[PDB]
Amino acid sequence: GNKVDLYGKAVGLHYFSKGNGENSYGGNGDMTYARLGFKGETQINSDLTGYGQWEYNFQGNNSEGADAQTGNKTRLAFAGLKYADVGSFDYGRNYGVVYDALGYTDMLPEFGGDTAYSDDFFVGRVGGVATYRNSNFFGLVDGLNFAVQYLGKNERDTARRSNGDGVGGSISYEYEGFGIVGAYGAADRTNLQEAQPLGNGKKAEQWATGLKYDANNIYLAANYGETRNATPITNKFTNTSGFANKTQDVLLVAQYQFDFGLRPSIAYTKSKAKDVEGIGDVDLVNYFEVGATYYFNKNMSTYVDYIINQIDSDNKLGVGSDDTVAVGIVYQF
Amino acid sequence: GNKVDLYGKAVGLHYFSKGNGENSYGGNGDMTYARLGFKGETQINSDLTGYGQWEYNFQGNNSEGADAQTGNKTRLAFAGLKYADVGSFDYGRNYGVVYDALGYTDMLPEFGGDTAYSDDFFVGRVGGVATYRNSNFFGLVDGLNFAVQYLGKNERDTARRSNGDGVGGSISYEYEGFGIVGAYGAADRTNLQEAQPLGNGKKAEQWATGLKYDANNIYLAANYGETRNATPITNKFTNTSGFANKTQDVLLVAQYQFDFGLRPSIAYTKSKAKDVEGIGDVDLVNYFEVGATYYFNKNMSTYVDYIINQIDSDNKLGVGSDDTVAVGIVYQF
Amino acid sequence: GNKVDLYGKAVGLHYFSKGNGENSYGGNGDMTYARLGFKGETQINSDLTGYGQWEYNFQGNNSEGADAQTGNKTRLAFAGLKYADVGSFDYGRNYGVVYDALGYTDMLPEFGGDTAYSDDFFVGRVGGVATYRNSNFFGLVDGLNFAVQYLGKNERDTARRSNGDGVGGSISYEYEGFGIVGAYGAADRTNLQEAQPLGNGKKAEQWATGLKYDANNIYLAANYGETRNATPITNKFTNTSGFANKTQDVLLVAQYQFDFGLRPSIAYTKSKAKDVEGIGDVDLVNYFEVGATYYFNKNMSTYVDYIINQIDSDNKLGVGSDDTVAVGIVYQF
Ligand SMILES: CC1(C)S[C@@H]2[C@H](NC(=O)[C@H](C(=O)O)c3ccccc3)[C@@H](O)N2[C@H]1C(=O)O
Numbered sequence: 001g002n003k004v005d006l007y008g009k010a011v012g013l014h015y016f017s018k019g020n021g022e023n024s025y026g027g028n029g030d031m032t033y034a035r036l037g038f039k040g041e042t043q044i045n046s047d048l049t050g051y052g053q054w055e056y057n058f059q060g061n062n063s064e065g066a067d068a069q070t071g072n073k074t075r076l077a078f079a080g081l082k083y084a085d086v087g088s089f090d091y092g093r094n095y096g097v098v099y100d101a102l103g104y105t106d107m108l109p110e111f112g113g114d115t116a117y118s119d120d121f122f123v124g125r126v127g128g129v130a131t132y133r134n135s136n137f138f139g140l141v142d143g144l145n146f147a148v149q150y151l152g153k154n155e156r157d158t159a160r161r162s163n164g165d166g167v168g169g170s171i172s173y174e175y176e177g178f179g180i181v182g183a184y185g186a187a188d189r190t191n192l193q194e195a196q197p198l199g200n201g202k203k204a205e206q207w208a209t210g211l212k213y214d215a216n217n218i219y220l221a222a223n224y225g226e227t228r229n230a231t232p233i234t235n236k237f238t239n240t241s242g243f244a245n246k247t248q249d250v251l252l253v254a255q256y257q258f259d260f261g262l263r264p265s266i267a268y269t270k271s272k273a274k275d276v277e278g279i280g281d282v283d284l285v286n287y288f289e290v291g292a293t294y295y296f297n298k299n300m301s302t303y304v305d306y307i308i309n310q311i312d313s314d315n316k317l318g319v320g321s322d323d324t325v326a327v328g329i330v331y332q333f
Numbered sequence: 334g335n336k337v338d339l340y341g342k343a344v345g346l347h348y349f350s351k352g353n354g355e356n357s358y359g360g361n362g363d364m365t366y367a368r369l370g371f372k373g374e375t376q377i378n379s380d381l382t383g384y385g386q387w388e389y390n391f392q393g394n395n396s397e398g399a400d401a402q403t404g405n406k407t408r409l410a411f412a413g414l415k416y417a418d419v420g421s422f423d424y425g426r427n428y429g430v431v432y433d434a435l436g437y438t439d440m441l442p443e444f445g446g447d448t449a450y451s452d453d454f455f456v457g458r459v460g461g462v463a464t465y466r467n468s469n470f471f472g473l474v475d476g477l478n479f480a481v482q483y484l485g486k487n488e489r490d491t492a493r494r495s496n497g498d499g500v501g502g503s504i505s506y507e508y509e510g511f512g513i514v515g516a517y518g519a520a521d522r523t524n525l526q527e528a529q530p531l532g533n534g535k536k537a538e539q540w541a542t543g544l545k546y547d548a549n550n551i552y553l554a555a556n557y558g559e560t561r562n563a564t565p566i567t568n569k570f571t572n573t574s575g576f577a578n579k580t581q582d583v584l585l586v587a588q589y590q591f592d593f594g595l596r597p598s599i600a601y602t603k604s605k606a607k608d609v610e611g612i613g614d615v616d617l618v619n620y621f622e623v624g625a626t627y628y629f630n631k632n633m634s635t636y637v638d639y640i641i642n643q644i645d646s647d648n649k650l651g652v653g654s655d656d657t658v659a660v661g662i663v664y665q666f
Numbered sequence: 667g668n669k670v671d672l673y674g675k676a677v678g679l680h681y682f683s684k685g686n687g688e689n690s691y692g693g694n695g696d697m698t699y700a701r702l703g704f705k706g707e708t709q710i711n712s713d714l715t716g717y718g719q720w721e722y723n724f725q726g727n728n729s730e731g732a733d734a735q736t737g738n739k740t741r742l743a744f745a746g747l748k749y750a751d752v753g754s755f756d757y758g759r760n761y762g763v764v765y766d767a768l769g770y771t772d773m774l775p776e777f778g779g780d781t782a783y784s785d786d787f788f789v790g791r792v793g794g795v796a797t798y799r800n801s802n803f804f805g806l807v808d809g810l811n812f813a814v815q816y817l818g819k820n821e822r823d824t825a826r827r828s829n830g831d832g833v834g835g836s837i838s839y840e841y842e843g844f845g846i847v848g849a850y851g852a853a854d855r856t857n858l859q860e861a862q863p864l865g866n867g868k869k870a871e872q873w874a875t876g877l878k879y880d881a882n883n884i885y886l887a888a889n890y891g892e893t894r895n896a897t898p899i900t901n902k903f904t905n906t907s908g909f910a911n912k913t914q915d916v917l918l919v920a921q922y923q924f925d926f927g928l929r930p931s932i933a934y935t936k937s938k939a940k941d942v943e944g945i946g947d948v949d950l951v952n953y954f955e956v957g958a959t960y961y962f963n964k965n966m967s968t969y970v971d972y973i974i975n976q977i978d979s980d981n982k983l984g985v986g987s988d989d990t991v992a993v994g995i996v997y998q999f
């Protein structure tokens with residue numbers, strides 16, 4: 001009794017930005033890519049299930065020459081066990097636990113989810129996490145779920161892609177369409193993260209909460225969160241980099257799903273850093289979004305995504321100020 | 334109603350060239366590689382089909398050490414829609430439209446197809462193409478097909494792997510075994526392509542025509558084509574590189590398919606550059622070919638391919654002059 | 667009549683070593699990875715079968731940034747034919763023939779198999795091998811198998827990953843649980859291998875023999891082998907590298923498989939180099955091992971592996987002396 005699904009998609013994707021598009025939100029040009037993966041689960045006995053998952057990213061916008069590898073990477077690589085009432089445990093490359101919150105608004109046709117950085121402690125996909133998860137409080141309280149997650153030190157060649165050891169967890173409740181969630185983690189920073197000109201401190205911290213309605217074809221959701229010494233930042237003007245001492249982040253999203261296949265989306269997003277050594281307060285993300293996805297079926301969809309960038313042109317960090325529109329076609333199985 | 338085929342092959346492949354084989358056609362040594370991909374199509378309603386495709390190259394002749402990645406790349410990555418009578422549209426990494434012509438002679442057991450360069454405007458696989466295709470002139474004229482294709486600027490780190498924006502198209506007719514085809518595209522060159530010592534001009538151009546017989550177990554085909562500022566060239570003697578100001582290209586091919594599984598092949602190929610700054614006229618490809626494929630079934634074949642190099646040893650560009658023989662075994666599914 | 671199995675596993679894997687763990691056996695930290703591959707065989711007629719195989723390694727412990735590619739590689743890439751009584755022939759990336767011996771003890775839950783180096787002439791996976799194999803001496807002598815294998819020159823960018831041409835073979839006999847095997851190959855070294863400070867000679871040589879019991883839930887096996895100029899070595903103290911002039915190697919292993927799924931393992935391993943220019947005699951591997959695998963089913967297992975390192979701290983080459991424990995969870999299909 002083993003079920004494995006091999007899964008994948010090919011994504012025909014173009015970004016439109018005024019000229020450059022180095023001073024825009026999304027960049028400009030060909031952004032085609034494909035994904036492949038497997039997801040597997042085995043029924044060991046009536047109370048115990050084993051599972052694993054691997055997912056990979058193939059960029060489809062590189063030449064077949066020296067740049068062929070750029071942006072190719074594993075996204076997910078993990079296995080675990082799920083015991084009847086007791087819960088699930090898994091280890092590997094997985095979603096940070098705070099993403100159990102940021103998942104609420106990470107719903108745009110192409111952009112959005114700006115605060116769920118990869119290899120960023122608890123907010124995105126990350127390497128070396130042991131994750132425990134519980135549904136319906138041991139079978140006892142419908143809709144009450146929680147989770148804890150242990151993050152091992154990754155002492156990588158770059159500050160940006162590193163972490164020290166850390167712990168994080170999340171708790172959420174769901175009653176007929178509404179969903180409330182909270183998530184928090186902290187972790188040691190590594191001497192290489194600390195040696196950076198931007199960011200000063202020994203612990204990195206991230207939390208977010210999330211509020212959502214999700215029934216009757218409507219999707220409304222908000223997320224508010226903060227970070228100390230965790231959000232990666234770069235100053236376009238001196239080529240310095242490191243981490244934002246604090247940030248505050250809000251993301252809102254409203255969508256509707258028509259039965260004929262259209263799903264319009266409006267979103268708002270702003271993320272403001274504080275106490276950035278040499279600058280003080282400066283915005284990182286600030287935009288409104290309109291877009292839509294048309295779903296032909298479960299296998300085929302198309303979409304447009306328009307980001308109305310509100311970041312000003314004098315922005316102390318050199319964060320792009322121009323709008324970006326993405327157009328995509330998708331085959332997935 | 335979705336059909337996905339996962340497909341692939343493992344190819345046991347060796348090149349034999351006198352010693353080096355740095356002054357030969359094909360090189361010398363282990364050239365084993367594997368391919369994997371998916372091809373998917375979904376029936377959305379009775380007139381509209383969605384599809385996508387991804388194909389990858391794994392070299393099998395690298396160590397498991399630092400060179401493990403060499404020659405690995407995505408070949409194809411695209412999705413599109415196909416509407417009843419109206420035609421197909423797809424975007425991503427795909428075959429340049431002029432390859433609708435070069436496809437005629439690109440039929441050898443191992444070599445051949447010398448003019449269908451990758452990341453070369455319209456002649457090979459290329460990134461960032463929107464391709465429209467029409468069969469039987471909107472259902473109205475059996476055998477009359479056409480296609481147009483828009484190529485977006487790829488401003489890559491190398492001249493060789495770049496293009497500016499361009500348009501190209503192709504038209505072909507097929508009546509009981511015979512096939513006639515024509516194809517043409519042009520495109521902007523990028524300032525990096527132009528800054529090269531070899532090649533001077535703002536537009537790159539390529540066209541080819543193709544003539545073919547393909548029934549009763551016979552395959553005869555020819556292709557003639559020309560290029561301005563599009564064919565990539567390198568001068569072995571100064572380590573300079575860029576693009577051939579003009580080239581003229583002919584490729585011929587004759588094959589027969591015995592019912593017991595053998596398929597011998599004889600081919601001719603020559604490609605001559607003109608107005609190469611510092612040299613004038615110099616050949617790039619010039620050879621005869623004999624070889625054969627033995628097909629055990631649809632899954633298993635083997636083959637030999639022998640290239641009788643006619644390029645002389647004094648060739649002004651340092652193009653290899655030695656013969657090359659390839660031997661290959663293939664499992665594919 | 668074609669059978670293709672797509673296969674794979676996701677492996678949740680952590681190494682524990684005292685602090686560093688740069689002076690240990692296994693290192694320290696996240697060591698998650700996944701594997702994917704295909705294995706295919708086609709029945710061409712009643713006496714002739716075609717087949718091929720490709721297998722790849724995706725590390726799951728890299729970031730999604732610049733280091734994304736580290737330790738990713740093809741492991742296997744080959745195709746061949748199998749003729750009724752006559753035997754099998756295959757070409758590509760495959761297991762060196764001497765591994766028909768080292769296979770005996772390469773059975774640990776995580777470590778072990780220390781002498782079966784990749785890209786190491788005949789002991790591990792290697793590129794460019796033509797391998798012939800025979801079972802039951804042409805159908806005439808049950809349990810008597812042999813094999814020969816031709817290795818083509820790989821003139822790679824590093825000494826470590828190179829070889830010249832070579833031949834190697836193996837012979838083995840199996841009678842109700844017992845198994846005896848012998849294997850030997852030699853090959854030319856390349857001028858780059860020879861230009862190395864460590865290792866002096868024109869031919870590289872490796873042989874091993876293997877003795878085993880394998881029935882009634884017991885697995886006992888030993889291997890003894892020697893090498894001239896083939897075992898790759900590095901001297902931590904001067905950053906010099908190359909090849910051990912001689913080594914002698916023994917590996918022993920004892921395991922039992924309980925029906926409920928547990929499989930404990932005890933192993934011994936030592937490999938001693940000789941005539942290492944600048945040092946004389948120095949150990950390379952020397953440890954005892956205890957560990958266990960618990961098999962939930964064919965799809966799911968977990969395991970611990972504990973290496974009691976016996977290499978001393980004054981070891982002339984800087985070979986790590988600390989213990990290492992690995993813990994792993996595995997989903998495979
Ligand atoms: C439903 C999925 C097959 S898709 C979804 C998540 N994967 C994706 O969203 C990716 C992607 O982000 O591109 C995906 C790739 C290919 C097809 C569909 C989704 C994976 O965690 N989830 C899978 C799952 O857990 O079942």
Ligand SMILES: CC1(C)S[C@@H]2[C@H](NC(=O)[C@H](C(=O)O)c3ccccc3)[C@@H](O)N2[C@H]1C(=O)O
Binds near residue numbers: 340342666
């Ligand atoms: C019939 C195919 C499965 S094979 C053919 C083209 N692919 C290949 O020729 C490749 C290759 O060039 O190696 C291939 C890989 C593996 C098996 C068979 C073919 C792809 O465009 N076409 C596929 C298709 O469009 O159906």
Ligand SMILES: CC1(C)S[C@@H]2[C@H](NC(=O)[C@H](C(=O)O)c3ccccc3)[C@@H](O)N2[C@H]1C(=O)O
Binds near residue numbers: 998999
């Ligand atoms: C039984 C296999 C499917 S697994 C075994 C060898 N492969 C592996 O052991 C790999 C690995 O070393 O990780 C493997 C990957 C994924 C699942 C099972 C095994 C391959 O040579 N053999 C395959 C075979 O020859 O049948």
